[PDB]
Design a protein around this ligand. Structure first.
Ligand SMILES: Nc1ncnc2c1ncn2[C@@H]1O[C@H](COP(=O)(O)OP(=O)(O)OC[C@H]2O[C@@H]([n+]3cccc(NC(=O)c4cccs4)c3)[C@H](O)[C@@H]2O)[C@@H](O)[C@H]1O
Ligand SMILES: Nc1ncnc2c1ncn2[C@@H]1O[C@H](COP(=O)(O)OP(=O)(O)OC[C@H]2O[C@@H]([n+]3cccc(NC(=O)c4cccs4)c3)[C@H](O)[C@@H]2O)[C@@H](O)[C@H]1O
Ligand SMILES: Nc1ncnc2c1ncn2[C@@H]1O[C@H](COP(=O)(O)OP(=O)(O)OC[C@H]2O[C@@H]([n+]3cccc(NC(=O)c4cccs4)c3)[C@H](O)[C@@H]2O)[C@@H](O)[C@H]1O
Ligand SMILES: Nc1ncnc2c1ncn2[C@@H]1O[C@H](COP(=O)(O)OP(=O)(O)OC[C@H]2O[C@@H]([n+]3cccc(NC(=O)c4cccs4)c3)[C@H](O)[C@@H]2O)[C@@H](O)[C@H]1O
Ligand SMILES: O=c1[nH]cnc2c1ncn2[C@@H]1O[C@H](COP(=O)(O)O)[C@@H](O)[C@H]1O
Ligand SMILES: O=c1[nH]cnc2c1ncn2[C@@H]1O[C@H](COP(=O)(O)O)[C@@H](O)[C@H]1O
Ligand SMILES: O=c1[nH]cnc2c1ncn2[C@@H]1O[C@H](COP(=O)(O)O)[C@@H](O)[C@H]1O
Ligand SMILES: O=c1[nH]cnc2c1ncn2[C@@H]1O[C@H](COP(=O)(O)O)[C@@H](O)[C@H]1O
Ligand SMILES: [K+]
Ligand SMILES: [K+]
Ligand SMILES: [K+]
Ligand SMILES: [K+]
Lengths: 379, 379, 379, 379
């Protein structure tokens, strides 16, 4: 009958809101806080949401969470905790190659965690970072001998001849080793690195909490727009994206995933956790832990500093914080009417998922307001 | 793996062309010849295309073809042929009520045609037209006694209190009789008639081959835009649309169906057929049959004429012409990558189906050109 | 000094006109006659212009001219003449496989023409057309045994599972045989065929002089826009384009090449030439030769005709007509300030080359006007 | 082959971001902090970047850095240091003509610095400022007798008959003396001054750190837009531009140079340096030096004040600060993929260089955020 024959029985949907393509075609240079995702239809419970994510072409994780390769964020303990909770961690390289290899070995030889990320031998997955310099090759070798599963080329500007040469060298010498390229914020850089043969991209420049690259070199891009554009280009070749930098809350993670990113990497949000490197200290009755950019003078100690050093308040253990992030992501997916992150991205690329801009007054309204005092308890 | 997890395994589609919503949002006042449908992907043969169409809320036809209720187009013979070939015909009402009832009876009592349109009693479906005047009520009664399955309220401007009153009267006295309202070209008229309780809409004003309403009363609308807008509004309430007027070739039928119409009604294209009323004559060696608008002075014989009278060249029998139209529609559906008209409309409403405008030079290029002489043989 | 340091010594260029990207982003559905190329700077003579063109990934021609695979256009003689003059011809397949193979053999065994197109063995290059049906495979084999250098899959709508399967079969059985896919007018079809592994694309649908596909199936695209879009997509993967259909004069060839096409294929312009198949006849004192679409009822003799049959006036020998086209293309390149077609396309993609739209009055002004009578002698 | 013939072998570049022309055609009134430069491709080291810049038509500097002619910024010592480090300084004129001439003489008679800016006699380059009043002529004479190499006409609004008359007088009496006109923010003012015969333009009004002209007289322009527009007009006649005012960090210098400026002049950034005039003092444990606008009541002591007076924190010696600025500019050039500032401007005018807007949230993200405390050490 006509009820089905007119358009296939699918009840029409009133057109309200903007698609991601429309939102990011205005050239406004948007970030996470500049927009919201409109709600959809709910016919499932939050606990049924699947957060399985692809870190690289061949590596798949049960959660989209990744720890940044920073000397104040990720060491063997942080990597072990992230792998157990369903994510992965990248060991920093501001150390001797032997120390990094030893940390990787500690991660690999570690012995309920149903979501634990493991390799074919039931060993916890581990990542590591290397540079684009000649010495890094030796470092890579040691990391290869320690059983590292994936390596990320660490650089503020990854579209360089040095990085392409290193990618080709790695692929020739270690064909089975997954390689992540970055950082990039434009489609041209992504094209160059994908042609080089990378298995994933790391997207972000200037958005880091401890980053001052934008005001020093005038180079960067708003995080949300960069994520959207790079993910849209990379999806044409089946290359996943890691949104790196600018993450402050679960909402940012959900927005990054909805815009095309397959994984999200956080430095500050995981900083000051128990598993993070360093020891807690006290200042004015507040418990804090050090957190610094790898380009800050302290980290590298004419030198042009690209980062700052400071402190972050204690957040507890990873084993309690990560489940909260997982629950928040699941609830966001339920609110937008998606049973999986893959479905979220499919809806966004198909135009089903709708977005809306936020004015400054809209941002004020969205946050806490009109209260004499209040306390915020996330969980 | 990433090949499926990024967006669900559906290979991305480059964005090329305009959606129907984009095409008809420019306010250019487009007709059929002003645009083309872009080709898609073929993974089936043309003969598998299903042309099942909904004439009304409860009446379904195996073909989308309908014959206009005109004194030079549709009588008992034309209706019988159209029903046998898979369509339906509406008996004109420029005659006594008894004559129209007798024609309806002839259609109903008629005794391989696999696509034949039949009612629950295996009797050929038949339609009829009535006016919005007091006398028409009596006419309707006779048509009801003859077994008519559907009635169309014939008027150049159907958004009138008289038509709404007649619709309510029919629904009260004949609850099981399907009623078609029209003609309308705007969403407001469609809203009024749908609220009245019509089972289908007849869309078109000024586009008829024998119509001069636009130049006499300055009232009308381009056919393609009217079809799109009225169909888009009516789909919200499950009300099918009959695109009436302006059809000159199979391409026009395909375009009308793709823009939202569930059926297409033709007066001139079926004129001069063997089953059409009247007798053939000869002029300058050309075999012709009369064809006139119901608003022309001849048809109604101060009077304001809204149509003209003339002649149309012979086209043969319906039993050979209609199969050609069916084959052409199937081939168009295959070219645009749809296995059914329902799928065509679903794709158009979902944005998958793409369109492109045509400049005057584009129209010239599309037609036959750069030939000293030629002969056109459709089939 | 400042004369060079400000911007590198390159004198600034006033911004006047539109780039191709700007021109074809308006969604107006433009054809060749709807726009003009603005002149540039001349610092060379016309005879220095290089017309070297890439027919496929591995086949390069000294001229961009190709003869269509039509039963009234290209046979052994036409192919031989085109190869000698610097182009190439594709043997039609509306014949027995043995006849086509014999024509290919005649072309291959033919024994000053400095621009002659030859293979590694100094044998004239020859192309042939095949269908996407099961029988065509056998045909292909014979064409392979006759020494054909390139094969084009002939279809009005080339984005089909059948064509992809045939492409894969050819690449598996004949890895060294160049394959041309088509016809396509959108970037999605081009993506599918390029992923299948074609070596070149054939772009055009509805623009043929003897084509009525647009009015019968409502499917097609304006030629210029299709050429631009498909060429822009294909250039990303190094796949050349053959603009097919709608060519009436040298200006159209130049426009097609400037919009991204690597070669141009003409059916009507080369029709009625001495080397074309068939015999001349006389009508009202005019010497004409037959020319028909391969989809016309005559060519294939329910059948849905997609072409017409007619006659075209005599044009002389190919050996005199082709040099005129070469000279005209060279003069157009000189006028737009390019020493080669490669440079033309580089300028167009870089935005240096500028275009302007043409109104109908502009088209009238561009043509001959305000004369009581005149005679047009091209050369 | 096709790899090179299609477009010349240059791999296509995905279109991402806006050109400067597109960015500044929106009429949004942008400043430095409102946009970012997108990264490019790196195939060289930062130390190979050439910062050679044209101060005027005939004067070329090895660095684009200039010191403002202010009584709290530039005296003989500051000029000597700037010339030694590769820039130049302009002696202020809020003093007796004899004092200014003596300072110029001190600069000229000063006796490793490979980048030192020297004249044909191996004497350090020196600039000076004069007004548009009758007395200034005498001042000019003394400055001419002291060996000044370039003179800048100091005025908040340089498009005046007085300034044009002074320019003509200088050119008539001192044909070989380079003259800088300003200040201007629009293309009409630039046209007038260029027609007068200036050798360079000084661009800025309302952007100074100590300037309140915008709120007092309602006259001014955002700095970035003014720089872009004036530079674009001046480049047509080979006239360089000095971006004056609004510089707070290296990123601002890089942005100003990328938008068309040939040199950058800073008052506040060089204020409180050791070579700056005045003596350090202490306030609340902070070491500060005075810095005031030349239009402030203190500087000129009804009077309409156009500037304010205050203090700036100590920054150290010029010989250490300037190298940091040079290194930062080089790193920015490397990040955007340019080996020289000339190449940067050529890329920007050709559209190769891309830009992106910044929302307020984008600005917040770009800066330091999400830290309990931190310390910023530039170098
Ligand atoms: N084969 C090569 N031959 C010759 N020349 C080469 C070669 N390869 C690169 N160059 C050039 O030398 C410069 C150096 O810069 P890179 O080594 O590329 O690191 P970087 O730019 O990210 O940070 C800046 C400083 O931070 C310190 N640090 C330590 C550990 C980790 C990080 N990670 C990050 O900060 C970020 C990651 C993601 C977003 S930020 C930073 C270190 O001291 C750096 O110098 C460039 O010009 C380059 O082209
Ligand atoms: N209860 C009512 N009480 C009082 N006043 C009423 C009432 N009801 C309507 N009026 C008003 O009287 C006028 C008459 O006009 P209608 O009867 O509505 O027919 P119409 O406007 O289509 O054509 C015009 C003339 O053609 C002749 N004719 C004969 C047979 C069929 C057609 N079909 C068509 O032509 C078309 C169909 C689709 C596109 S064209 C035409 C006839 O002689 C007409 O007068 C209007 O003002 C109206 O409001
Ligand atoms: N393996 C397969 N198994 C099953 N079903 C298949 C398979 N493969 C395709 N089908 C389907 O059967 C139909 C047939 O159509 P095709 O063979 O694709 O040719 P076509 O559509 O271009 O022209 C139309 C008619 O012209 C005649 N003719 C003869 C020689 C050359 C041409 N060249 C052209 O005209 C043009 C070239 C460029 C622009 S026009 C035409 C012939 O009689 C045709 O039937 C389609 O539905 C298709 O999907
Ligand atoms: N031949 C002439 N005959 C007759 N009338 C003339 C003639 N020439 C100009 N007038 C008119 O008299 C007024 C005076 O104004 P100017 O002398 O043009 O200086 P100014 O407007 O920049 O600053 C304002 C006050 O600051 C004090 N001061 C001292 C030293 C340096 C500066 N430099 C700056 O501040 C800036 C530079 C770049 C951006 S700001 C300022 C001084 O006391 C000023 O009066 C105008 O109306 C004018 O048309
Ligand atoms: O020193 C630095 N300068 C600039 N960016 C940095 C530096 N150190 C780390 N980053 C980047 O900023 C990210 C930290 O993001 P966040 O802490 O979540 O805001 C890291 O994962 C790196 O991509
Ligand atoms: O006399 C008339 N004046 C105006 N419209 C008419 C008249 N007669 C019929 N029509 C309409 O025009 C249609 C004919 O369309 P066509 O003959 O396919 O061009 C009919 O089905 C009516 O909707
Ligand atoms: O019968 C047909 N129907 C539709 N298109 C055709 C037919 N025959 C040839 N063509 C196409 O039209 C082209 C002829 O272009 P033209 O003769 O230069 O205008 C051929 O090369 C085919 O691509
Ligand atoms: O008193 C003033 N009122 C307005 N502008 C001034 C005044 N003094 C200096 N300026 C301008 O402001 C610039 C200082 O820029 P900044 O200190 O880098 O922010 C100088 O080079 C002059 O162009
Ligand atoms: K709120
Ligand atoms: K045509
Ligand atoms: K003309
Ligand atoms: K930041």
């Amino acid at each position: 009958m006509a009820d089905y024959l007119i358009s296939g029985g699918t009840s029409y949907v009133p057109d309200d809101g903007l698609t991601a393509q429309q939102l990011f075609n205005c050239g406004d240079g948007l970030t996470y806080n500049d927009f919201l995702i409109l709600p959809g239809y709910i016919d499932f419970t939050a606990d049924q949401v699947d957060l399985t994510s692809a870190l690289t072409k061949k590596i798949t994780l049960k959660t989209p969470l990744v720890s940044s390769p920073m000397d104040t964020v990720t060491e063997a303990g942080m990597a072990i905790a992230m792998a157990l909770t369903g994510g992965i961690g990248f060991i920093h390289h501001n150390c001797t190659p032997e120390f990094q290899a030893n940390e990787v070995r500690k991660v690999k030889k570690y012995e309920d965690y149903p979501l634990a990320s493991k390799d074919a031998k039931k060993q916890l997955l581990c990542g590591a970072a290397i540079g684009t310099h000649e010495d890094d090759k030796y470092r890579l070798d040691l990391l290869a001998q320690a059983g590292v599963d994936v390596v990320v080329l660490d650089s503020s500007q990854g579209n360089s001849i040095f990085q392409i040469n290193m990618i080709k060298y790695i692929k020739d010498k270690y064909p089975n080793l997954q390689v992540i390229g970055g950082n990039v914020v434009t489609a041209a850089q992504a094209k160059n690195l994908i042609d080089a043969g990378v298995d994933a991209l790391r997207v972000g420049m200037g958005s880091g909490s401890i980053c001052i690259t934008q005001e020093v070199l005038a180079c960067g891009r708003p995080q949300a727009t960069a994520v959207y554009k790079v993910s849209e280009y990379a999806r044409r070749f089946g290359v996943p994206v890691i949104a790196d930098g600018g993450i402050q809350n679960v909402g940012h993670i959900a927005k990054a995933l909805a815009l095309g990113a397959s994984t999200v990497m956080m430095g500050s949000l995981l900083a000051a956790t128990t598993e993070a490197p360093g020891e807690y200290f006290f200042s004015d009755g507040i418990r804090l832990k050090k957190y610094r950019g790898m380009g800050s003078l302290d980290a590298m100690d004419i030198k042009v500093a690209q980062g700052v050093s400071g402190a972050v308040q204690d957040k507890g253990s990873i084993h309690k914080f990560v489940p909260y992030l997982i629950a928040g992501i699941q609830h966001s997916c339920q609110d937008i009417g998606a049973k999986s992150l893959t479905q979220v991205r499919a809806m966004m690329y198909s135009g089903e998922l709708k977005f809306e801009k936020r004015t400054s007054s809209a941002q004020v309204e969205g946050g806490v307001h009109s209260l004499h005092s209040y306390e915020k308890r996330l969980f």
